């Protein structure tokens, strides 16, 4: 923290923002592609739903 | 799971349902267990609805003492029938118990030693009938029904049909070792494709006339 503040950078704020953005990326990826639908999990996505018709 | 294609009409019915009204005879029974059949169980099935259960003793007399109490006229049945008790039906009478990891998954199975009504007589009963042979078969109005027994030798059951699975067999092409349902007739006319031992091919839902 001290060395990051030495270059006028808040290490904690950047890491917290990155944590929030990573969680948002995870949510977006789950919404767009599902999560482990191949393994049998029933979390589907906008592009990976097995009920959806073929292209 | 969700409608992926809109059709011009609806299905005539679902297996285990009554599609016609008229004279009919059904009796209550208890599912018992396939693990209690004396000659082991050469054929095995998960107590599905459109299956022909057979008698396996009575459970009328209650009490372990010397004076018994016959509370009600009850009978216990097994899916691999030797003497045909009845084809299980009316799936609206039961509850969706579970599917071993999915409590809400679509299942037609009954838990062991549960309640059920088995149809001896039915004006028209929607069931599923399997093919007793590896080749395709066209079943029409003038065709009979026969159900697999649990004591069916594995040589006779090459296709690996379930315990109480119903089968259409034309009129003189009965697969060896199958047990016929007397005076049972196939009302609707369908055609089942060729199948192998592994993939089978669940027979299309179809109306049959029982006794």
What phi and psi, each to the nearest 5 degrees, are found at residue B100? 60, 65
A35 vs A4, A25, B101, CA distance in Å?
A: 36, 13, 19
Angstrom distance (rounded) from CA B137 to CA B131: 7
Angstrom distance (rounded) from CA B107 to CA B98: 7
Angstrom distance (rounded) from CA B32 to CA B78: 6
Measured between CA atoms, how close is B3 to chain A, in angstroms? 8
Q: DSSP character for B38? A: T
Helix (H, G, I), strand (E, B) or coil at A12: helix
Angstrom distance (rounded) from CA B54 to CA B84: 5
**Is the CB of residue B205 less than 8 Å from the CB of residue B13?**
yes
For residue B28, the Cα-to-chain-centroid distance in whole angstroms is: 15
Q: Which of B49, B11, B17 is nearest to B123 (CA)?
A: B17
**Is the minimum CB–CB distance between A51 and chain B shorter than 8 Å?**
yes
Measured between CA atoms, how close is B5 to chain A, in angstroms? 9
Helix (H, G, I), strand (E, B) or coil at B47: coil
Taking an 8 Å cut-off on Cβ atoms, the answer to whether B1 and A53 are in contact is no
Residue B5's closest chain A neighbor by CA?
A53
Angstrom distance (rounded) from CA B153 to CA B133: 15
Angstrom distance (rounded) from CA B76 to CA B96: 21
Q: Enter the tokens of residue B208.
A: 């049959």
Task: Tell the residue number behind the tokens 């027979």, with chain if given.
Answer: B203
Resolution reached, in Å? 2.9
**Contacts with A52 from chain B: Cβ below 8 Å:** 4
């Amino acid at each position: 923290e001290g060395r990051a503040s030495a270059i006028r950078l808040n290490s904690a704020e950047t890491k917290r923002q990155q944590a929030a953005i990573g969680l948002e990326i995870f949510r977006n990826a789950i919404g767009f592609y599902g999560w482990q639908s191949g393994l049998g999990n029933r979390t589907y996505g906008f592009l990976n739903d097995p009920n959806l018709p073929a292209f | 799971m969700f409608q992926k294609q809109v059709y011009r009409q609806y299905t005539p019915g679902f297996p285990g349902d009554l599609i016609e009204d008229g004279p009919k005879r059904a009796r209550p029974g208890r599912i018992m267990s396939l693990s209690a059949v004396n000659p082991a169980a050469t054929a095995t099935g998960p107590n599905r609805i459109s299956r022909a259960f057979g008698y396996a003793g009575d459970v009328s007399a209650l009490g372990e003492g010397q004076p018994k109490t016959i509370a009600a006229r009850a009978s216990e049945v097994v899916i691999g029938g030797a003497n045909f008790f009845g084809v299980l039906g009316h799936p609206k009478h039961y509850a969706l118990f579970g599917s071993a990891g999915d409590s809400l998954a679509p299942s037609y199975d009954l838990p062991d030693g549960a309640e059920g009504e088995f149809f001896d007589m039915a004006t028209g009963l929607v069931v599923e009938i399997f093919n007793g042979a590896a080749t395709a078969l066209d079943l029409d109005y003038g065709d009979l029904v026969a159900y697999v027994p649990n004591n069916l030798p594995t040589a006779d059951n090459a296709l690996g049909l379930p315990a109480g699975a119903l089968v259409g067999f034309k009129a003189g092409s009965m697969p060896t070792g199958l047990v016929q349902i007397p005076n049972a007739r196939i009302v609707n006319a369908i055609s089942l494709p060729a199948q192998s031992a592994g993939n089978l091919v669940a027979g299309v839902t179809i109306v049959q006339l029982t006794q």
